[PDB]
């Protein structure tokens, strides 16, 4: 009957989600309310900076998107999806959007700042995580995808660069730029090459099963220290992905390999997360037998490691990036395209 408690939880969560989805928060702060401190990461049309909110003194991570660059890259609807979905969701392993607003030049999303840095950084430095360590993070992704999928959302960009570690050692999922609310199938080609499911590559319609394939790639990369399909150029990576061959380090436990064979499954009628039992084939797999799902959700499980915290506003868990001054044009750019933002 654990199954019925889950359904009840998800039912109320959908209620909450839909209210906000149908009536999105909009224009809830202004640039001059924040002191910009330092860039925490970048992307093709913007950057995320640490900022301090002047009226409260709280730090946040502010994503600043250049409207013109969004348009030139044809990401207008994806950016509208991002903001509309993020303002509507609520889960312990999802970064919160606290304010959003826009000006003549830019869009702005002010989110919680997660000072522990990216999983990417920690994983590359340590080499790989032990199985218990990877399982702890993996479990949080499983619960987060169960949450998001129940709301008809596909996430579509899972990777260590887009998972942050918070002060308690838990995961915060960021980067909703490709997230989409869709019943049935969708066709956009998007994600990150190492993580794309075969059906995205082969230009088929696809669905939330692509996020379960991506979890297979993530667990493999956490536990091996490299991904299951890598090469020097994306086309070589795609050929590996669609080949239907995968090999596992000799140190992977046989339960880990069995779980990954079922997630990294090219045949959709057989991919875990995608069968009649849904996420339950994953939650009940042997590799997760030690996992107490509720304890994980409640953040009662002791984390594998706690990031060094030097203080509020410290960024030493993040790489340094070149800074650039924000310029706000005296003319409104792209007003119609971003009207509902």
């Amino acid at each position: 009957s654990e199954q019925e408690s889950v359904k009840e939880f998800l039912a109320k969560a959908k209620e909450d989600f839909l209210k906000k989805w149908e009536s999105p928060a909009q224009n809830t702060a202004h640039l001059d309310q924040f002191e910009r401190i330092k860039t925490l990461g970048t992307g093709s049309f913007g950057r995320v900076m640490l900022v301090k909110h002047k009226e409260t003194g709280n730090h946040y991570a502010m994503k600043i998107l250049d409207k013109q660059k969004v348009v030139k890259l044809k990401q207008i609807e994806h950016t509208l999806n991002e903001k509309r979905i993020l303002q509507a969701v609520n889960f312990p392993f999802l970064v919160k959007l606290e304010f959003s607003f826009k000006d003549n030049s830019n869009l702005y999303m002010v989110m919680e700042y997660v000072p522990g840095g990216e999983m990417f950084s920690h994983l590359r430095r340590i080499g790989r995580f032990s199985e218990p360590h990877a399982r702890f993070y993996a479990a949080q992704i499983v619960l987060t995808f169960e949450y998001l999928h129940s709301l008809d959302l596909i996430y579509r960009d899972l990777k260590p660069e887009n998972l942050l570690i918070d002060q308690q050692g838990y995961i915060q999922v960021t980067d909703f730029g490709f997230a989409k609310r869709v019943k049935g199938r969708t066709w956009t080609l998007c994600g990150t090459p190492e993580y794309l499911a075969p059906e995205i590559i082969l230009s088929k319609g696809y669905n939330k099963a692509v996020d379960w394939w991506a979890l297979g790639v993530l667990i493999y990369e956490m536990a091996a220290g490299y991904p299951p399909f890598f090469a020097d150029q994306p086309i070589q990576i795609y050929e590996k992905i669609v080949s239907g061959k995968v090999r596992f380090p000799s140190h992977f436990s046989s339960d880990l390999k069995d779980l990954l064979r079922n997630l990294l499954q090219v045949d959709l009628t057989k991919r875990f997360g995608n069968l009649k039992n849904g996420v339950n084939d994953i939650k009940n797999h042997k590799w997760f037998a030690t996992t107490d799902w509720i304890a994980i959700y409640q953040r009662k499980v002791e984390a594998p490691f706690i990031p060094k915290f030097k203080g509020p506003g410290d960024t030493s868990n993040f790489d340094d990036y070149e800074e650039e001054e924000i310029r706000v044009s005296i003319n409104e750019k792209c007003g119609k395209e971003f009207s509902e933002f």
């Binding site: 093709s44 044809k74 730029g177 080609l189 490299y226 020097d232 994306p234």
Partner: peptide, 20 residues
């Protein structure tokens, strides 16, 4: 070793999103 092959490849830094 596969690890050594990964470490010597040009895709151990942060990987950019792609799209059409």
């Amino acid at each position: 070793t596969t690890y050594a092959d990964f470490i010597a490849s040009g895709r151990t830094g942060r990987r950019n999103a792609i799209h059409d």
